[PDB]
Design brief:
Four copies of one chain form a homotetramer. Chain A has 466 residues and is α+β, with helices and mostly antiparallel strands. Helix content of chain A is 44%, strand content 13%. In chain A, the strands form four sheets. The first copy, chain A, has a four-stranded mixed sheet with strand order 3-4-9-10, with no helix packed on it. Chain A has a three-stranded antiparallel sheet with strand order 7-11-8, sandwiched between helices. The radius of gyration of chain A is 24 Å and the shape is globular. In chain A, 53% of the residues are buried. The structure holds guanosine-5'-triphosphate (2 copies), 2'-deoxyadenosine 5'-triphosphate (DTP) (4 copies) and magnesium ion (4 copies). One 2'-deoxyadenosine 5'-triphosphate sits between chains D (44-45, 207, 254, 260) and B (211, 214, 239, 400). Chain D: This is Deoxynucleoside triphosphate triphosphohydrolase SAMHD1. Chain D: One of its GO terms (cellular component) is tetraspanin-enriched microdomain. Chain D: DCTP 2 binds at residues 7, 44, 215, 234, 236, 254, 258-259, 399.
Chain lengths: 466, 458, 461, 455
């Protein structure tokens, strides 16, 4: 067997090695056809119909482009076809762990439904990957193409989730750079972002300001602190700052859209009210809940955006409350956006504090009185992907005149117009009562609360609260 | 009220009148979010994740663009906002009737599951539309914006499905041109095509060779045989031929892709095996089947691509056979392509004949025995949307020097490189049994059947 | 009625016959022979676009915005007269550009006529006047209901700002209740105007770079409201993040393309060649009077003939007088370019002023390194990065409205939007190049540069 | 030496080998920056500002993509880096011979100004290429990267123009025959030049874009065909190849043969004719040439670009007044006037205006017209091989037998394809623009159509 070719609108005609095809053609992978990339975003941006599946193809492709580019430019690195395939597999599979409506699931639902657990989609991707390989007889196929499953499966997992002194077992320090491609734990510059920037922009109605292809052409491996790392050409540092600007633009405009988020929130609410009643059969016929399906991959395999429609179309009276919420989404009786503010302090509102926030807004004393249950307060952390840190400080560069010498480039060396801060918090407030009287009041509470807390004046404060 | 603005990747920022928004924000319309434009095409073209919903928005928008362009250019036509809204509503709603996996449903499943009925998605769109309006109190909202429901609802239905002498009740002969926008029964040149060309191309990675915005700018209404018709500028005729060429390119490459079609076929097969066991709740809690959900719009409202997953994820042993078929799709163990005939010019084989064809192939005795149930026979039409007729012969044009005089332009006036024929047919045959022995036999039956019928080719 | 033109950025554009009449003149068609990005084309092969097509785009977008406002707000009393005047101003604001666009007013004129104060905007106004007067356009304007005296003043004002002192309303062409009309083509209050929108889209299309700001969205959300007794265009409050993105895009385009090191050195070499050819090239102006490249700006009939063509005239000449200028252009073709020596790190604000630029090569040559080159051997390029208003934040000069009170204008400060935004809105850096390309000359130039950086207390290699 | 990277809007970031850069950075190549791809088309489609230069980069790039794809897929073909570079050079350089306003120059101006000569831009590309190599010391550079100049220069020329004087090629043997199919495919016209211009012209014109061209590369394979190794396409792809020529024809109808774009090319031609004697272009040894004779000396030709247009427009010399007036009429949009169209051989074209003037119409006329007053434009629409179907000259392979080449006939593909692959229209224009002259021109035209038949 040789290559399948797939026409992707973002990347064009992509060639896939038969081993990759084998992996793709499984229930575990094809599942991703039923999970929207942007979850509730589709309910705001009608072009955002794309699912995780096509995004995963893009990531595997780009991973392969980068590893190949490096091997061609730098034969001395001894990159093998085995390495290439392992990297591509990791790129293809890093999204395997996503649940219904993507980041809604691990960002909102699981934290509320299982506050005791620490779960991320990455962990899910690793478990789902195991289940995919084991269930479908992929290990012998891997061997048939020269992979060594013990080492390589560990390598692939490590590329997705990080380690399970050099903390990695799958490859040695002299292949360290291979771990920088798919999910770059040092600085977040990886092929996953490059695909989603291009793909989301295409579907969204926007065009990305950073070119992934250019970055691949200027990438080189250099020694950095006794590690072989991928470095970028010095010239490119402005582009990297642009990259994270784009990322942040995309968060502002789409991923954290005020209405997209409230729809994600309403879905989450509905999943919570349904969690006790929906049964998902896992291994050996054992029954799981939406919140526990993450403990068994056979059950998880069946957990997709379909759960939304299962609730919407149900007749069971136990689900009436969950069903009503989803019905309100369809009529567009959503909760109403009241305003946004930020903390002025460097200390951030912590996850445990979130719950108390509606009570606080209702407490504020500026026709109708409003209760805490009437308000929704959404805390959004916006940053450059590494909390307070500047990821560019964690990038190595090289100059044209000395390609092998890795260097750091500080923010002040690039521009004084860059951010002084790399992380912030936005508080959005919504009201569940939608009549004009309730809204006007909600506005008053909000502005008063912002003044009480010493938060930033909402942009429309003069108008909504004179 | 003021307009909602929606960012569409194909058309950019689109303004929607509140009455349209009211119609959109209903279970009946939002349903379209869960029906893929290209059905099983997504399983071949990974970018084709788009659903009927966004396409419907595009169609409504373009309908509005055209009606507005005409009203602005030609005040004498007396086009009202009422007309504009009715046209937009019809554009928004002409895809309402589509079922799971779009053309799979009315093209494959319903013909096999209810051969007695004559159902098209257009008829479904009309029934859905009625249900949408009645269920959601839209009529008073229509009146609030100056529409007259009895006439206008009839007008909207007529725009989608044709007439229910001047055969139309919704508008008189002096507004005839309004019927040419959304679903053009004279020649197929309408806004539905323009949206899907652009949108499908964007998602597929293919190119649209026809510029719809241009066509709108050069469109004019002129008197043609005592009717006021939309006419195109004379020099646009080459573009109209290109438009149908593009349509046909899109059919060859994507809509009738061999593997996209076989996946639609396998899905159909699974729906058939599940039809007796899946329940869809309709009005009053009554339970419907997949094949009968078309009789109750409350049940039809919930019939979407979701059924696929409901079968895939079931544990009921009665559904094991349907579930297995879908599982085979996931492993890529598909029904196998046996062969196709070379194209013949006739468009000989008619829709009613399709059902008998597998029996026929099985009947062939060539030089492992197979039954009719083992074969699938797919009749593929390539034409210019009006069977043997050239649709451009049914288009009126005007010249720059005499904008009010409508004229005809014949094929020979345009180019000798154009088609001599406007319709053709191919037959593809597939086998449900996938084991080498079964395949070899299927090939024999196929070749023999081709010889018996006087068709040709591998 | 209308001509239709297919533009790749905007699609099929309709033009009113008066506009067509203006376009179909030597003065306007001239713009076909002036590259948008000058020497950028020698770095970005897609950047073949000329000012002409950009101008059509600007006129179109001007018309889109004025129409959108008039449709949404009949109470503003926007007339077809106003629409046409705005479109004319949009079409014509690039008329004054010289060969290789910003090279000409940014580099060549300052070196060739240091005594003169000349900008392309001022050129646009003069060229506009010459276009109308030379081609009998005034009667055509009157035929479509324009009143030339008021409207020509209005059009000029829209391009260059007030022609006429403390102060309140400084414009004559339209009153305060039409103030918003001045915000469309060349927005002197904050730089948010249709010129940027077209060039963002067009430059990105040709460059292969990407625009992060959507102009058409901004038009749909734009509304006029009363602000300090003026009727001003206001943006929807939630669009403020997009406006910040717009200035980010602008700056991305400067960094990547408009101030590309090699694009700039190629502009410099062209400038040098024009300087060496200035005495020999003759351009016939009014009455047969002969002008030079540097004096063609004094007569619009001569200026009309001054385009990128001059480059090729010099390149393909055989006249021995032009040998020096020709050699420079030939070095461009062989890619034997003036050599990049180094640049400083950015320093906040725009400390070095335009007037100071000329002294800088003398200064670098004056530096005495511990380990010989003249001022004429060096080129020193001052590069400004800002938000288009020196040290000011342009968004502080934007009015907004909220959904719940569309008629009430408000201000939104930076800290209301994001803490990730710039603390500073302007910065500068200095690049140095050497005209002598041999290794010995280069090594020396590096020494002078490093020494000069140490002397001045600057930073970086 | 490493690669230069160039950002091209059509193809993205392109890598160029230093030898290619050395060829590009010459007066002979850079000249192409000053020649518009679509000539007078820019005066109708304002986005069509693109020049031959950027198109040439694209062609060199796509040539390299194809040759590399084949070498990677089929190691047994023994494709060397030498071959790759020679192919890329040929792709870069096949447009070198184009004159002012591209096809206007060899299609209109040279036939009218030097009817005795037989000149095409391809021949020009070969001569210019020789001049570029010899003038700039490129031969030693070629050797420095492993080329053998005598063979490889011949090979490059052959790729552009065909055989110079059984296997008729000297540059490569029969077992590398497929290499000759990449840059300028004389068998069927399917080559990288078309792929670039489709994408690029569409991007600039404002027609929409596709990637089918990269698709064709992925499915291309070399197979034995009649004892030659030829590039074959996957059977599946035959519909796409038909689409390719449909697109080509769409582009001709809409843009390349636009009625007004052509009349502008015609007016530019007319102006060049009236200026030909007065413009001097210095060639080798200081010898002076004309616009029409610059094609005899590559040093002079090097300097012949769209610039000539402006040189005429901006002149004050009274000898150039007639040429300058025509160009001025272009700017005021007072164009030669379209008289009509009617639905044969190249040699006949020049006699056609004389013939239309000879026609004696019945009608009483305000003015008599001469041959010099008429322009007659013969417009060929075809599939690039006159009457032949180029797909009949394409070899295909099937998935199950990749090494066996086969033919696929038109009737195997679709009955909706053209019955004819070539057609002609005649357009007539009048240089005199007053109403009296126009009315008369109409009469002559209609009468001429009746006289010739084909009314
Ligand atoms: N007039 C004019 N048209 C241009 C220009 N650039 C591109 N075009 C396009 O060229 C097309 C053809 O030129 P027209 O001036 O319309 O020529 P025509 O159609 O022969 O003459 P009309 O009968 O006046 O329309 C126009 O419709 C425009 O879309 C320009 O600078 N001036
Ligand atoms: N050499 C060359 N580069 C071009 C041309 N057109 C566009 N370019 C691009 O412009 C950039 C110009 O820089 P170079 O010629 O490399 O100039 P430089 O970087 O100072 O010189 P190097 O040190 O050789 O890189 C290149 O990297 C190309 O991407 C051309 O005609 N010749
Ligand atoms: N003509 C086309 N243009 C663009 N994309 C196409 C075209 N035909 C098919 N595609 C898309 C659908 C798929 O994503 C990809 C490959 O499809 P296709 O080439 O038809 O392969 P296939 O696997 O169906 O055929 P085979 O196995 O016979 O090679 O290209
Ligand atoms: N910055 C942006 N750029 C591009 N598209 C956007 C941007 N912001 C939102 N969109 C998209 C999402 C929707 O399809 C459409 C309208 O969104 P938006 O203006 O955010 O409306 P909204 O209904 O949330 O706000 P409001 O009701 O306050 O006007 O535009
Ligand atoms: N089929 C087409 N598709 C896309 N663009 C086109 C097409 N035909 C022409 N154009 C472009 C070129 C111009 O910029 C614009 C208008 O051209 P076009 O309509 O052909 O000529 P014209 O408008 O001068 O004819 P007329 O004056 O007779 O109306 O559209
Ligand atoms: N940030 C960018 N984004 C997109 N294109 C760019 C960018 N910077 C430059 N380009 C374009 C212009 C050129 O066509 C091509 C290469 O330019 P660039 O990388 O700046 O090389 P250079 O030759 O100027 O630098 P060096 O020789 O130092 O590598 O890419
Ligand atoms: Mg296949
Ligand atoms: Mg809203
Ligand atoms: Mg015209
Ligand atoms: Mg360089």
């Amino acid at each position: 067997d040789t290559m399948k070719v797939i026409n992707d609108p973002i990347h064009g005609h992509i060639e896939l090695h038969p081993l990759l095809v084998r992996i793709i053609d499984t229930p575990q992978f094809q599942r991703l056809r039923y999970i929207k990339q942007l979850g509730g975003g589709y309910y705001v941006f009608p072009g955002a119909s794309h699912n995780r599946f096509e995004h995963s193809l893009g990531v595997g492709y780009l991973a392969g482009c980068l590893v190949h580019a490096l091997g061609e430019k730098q034969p001395e690195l001894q990159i093998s076809e085995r390495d290439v395939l392992c990297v591509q597999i990791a790129g293809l599979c890093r999204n395997l762990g996503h649940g219904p409506f993507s980041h809604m699931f691990d960002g909102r639902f699981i934290p509320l439904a299982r506050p005791e657990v620490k779960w991320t989609h990455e962990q899910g991707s690793v478990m789902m990957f195991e289940h995919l390989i084991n269930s479908n007889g992929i290990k012998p196929v891997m061997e048939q193409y020269g992979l060594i499953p013990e080492e390589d499966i560990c390598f692939i997992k490590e590329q997705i989730v990080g380690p399970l002194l050099w903390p990695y077992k799958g490859r040695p320090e002299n292949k360290s750079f291979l771990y920088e491609i798919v999910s770059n734990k040092r600085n977040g510059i990886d092929v996953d972002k490059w695909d989603y920037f291009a793909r989301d922009c295409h579907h969204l109605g926007i065009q990305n300001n950073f070119d992934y292809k250019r970055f691949i052409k200027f990438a080189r491996v250099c020694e950095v602190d006794n590690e072989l790392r991928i470095c970028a050409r010095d010239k490119e540092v402005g582009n990297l700052y642009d990259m994270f600007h784009t990322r942040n633009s995309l968060h502002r405009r789409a991923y954290q859209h005020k209405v997209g988020n409230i729809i994600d929130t309403m879905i989450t609410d509905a999943f919570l009210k349904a969690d006790d009643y929906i049964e998902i059969t896992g291994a050996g016929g054992k029954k799981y809940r939406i919140s526990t399906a993450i403990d068994d991959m056979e059950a998880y395999t069946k957990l997709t955006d379909n759960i939304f429609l299962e609730i919407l179309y149900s007749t069971d009276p136990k689900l009436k409350d969950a069903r009503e919420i989803l019905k309100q989404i369809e009529y567009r009786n959503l909760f109403k956006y009241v305003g946004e503010t930020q903390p002025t302090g460097q200390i951030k509102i912590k996850r445990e504090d979130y719950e108390s926030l509606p009570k606080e807004v209702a407490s504020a004393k500026p026709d109708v009185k409003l209760k805490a249950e009437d308000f929704i307060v959404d805390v959004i952390n916006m940053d450059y992907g590494m909390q307070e840190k500047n990821p560019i400080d964690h990038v190595s560069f090289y100059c044209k005149t000395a390609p092998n010498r890795a260097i750091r480039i500080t923010k002040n060396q690039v521009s004084q117009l860059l951010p002084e801060k790399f992380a912030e918090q936005l508080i959005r407030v919504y009201c569940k009562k939608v009549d004009r009287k309730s809204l006007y009041a909600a506005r008053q509470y909000f502005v008063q609360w912002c003044a009480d807390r010493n938060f930033t004046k909402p942009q429309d404060g003069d108008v909504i609260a004179p």
